[PDB]
Design brief:
Spike protein S2' (chain C), 25% helix, viral protein, part of a larger assembly, 3 chains, membrane fusion, binds 2-acetamido-2-deoxy-beta-D-glucopyranose, rod-shaped, 48 residues, glycoprotein, mainly alpha
Chain lengths: 48, 49, 48
């Protein structure tokens, strides 16, 4: 069996290429800018 | 009501207890600092983002 | 715990047997689109 008539068709596909690039300031996250939090934070060094 | 909360539970809206004037709270200002340099071989002048 | 997969073993068998029978009676046409009836030595002649 050999094809005689035919068709064409467009299909779509979708795939991401990037991401929502973020950033987290530590002071306004782990502290909330209390003076107490920044001074126990030195006991963890430059972990942030 | 006396105080509003945001979509996360931090108080961003204060009604004044004295004048019943309702006010938003913004953060103070925070962000990041970046530095622009052409290279220490090239100059000694910087731009700051 | 462990959960059994959806696509079971006999399904995993029966999708695999149709990869063989259709390759054995339609060959290139089995994957190229609508599978087409054809002798197997003709399929080899197509491949070779
Ligand atoms: C870069 O520095 C070297 C010495 O460290 C100097 O010889 C050279 O002239 C400098 N480049 C330019 C463009 O001045």
């Amino acid at each position: 069996a050999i094809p005689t008539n035919f068709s064409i068709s467009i299909t779509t596909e979708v795939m991401p290429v990037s991401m929502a690039k973020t950033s987290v300031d530590c002071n306004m996250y782990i502290c909330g800018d209390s003076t107490e939090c920044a001074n126990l934070l030195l006991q963890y060094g430059s972990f942030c | 009501q006396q105080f509003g909360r945001d979509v996360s539970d931090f108080t961003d809206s204060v009604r004044d207890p004295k004048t019943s004037e309702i006010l938003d709270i913004s953060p103070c200002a925070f962000g990041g600092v970046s530095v622009i340099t052409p290279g220490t071989n090239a100059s000694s002048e910087v731009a700051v983002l | 715990t462990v959960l059994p997969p959806l696509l079971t073993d006999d399904m995993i068998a029966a999708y695999t047997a149709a990869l063989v029978s259709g390759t054995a009676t339609a060959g290139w046409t089995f994957g190229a689109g609508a599978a087409l009836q054809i002798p197997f030595a003709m399929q080899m002649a197509y491949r070779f």
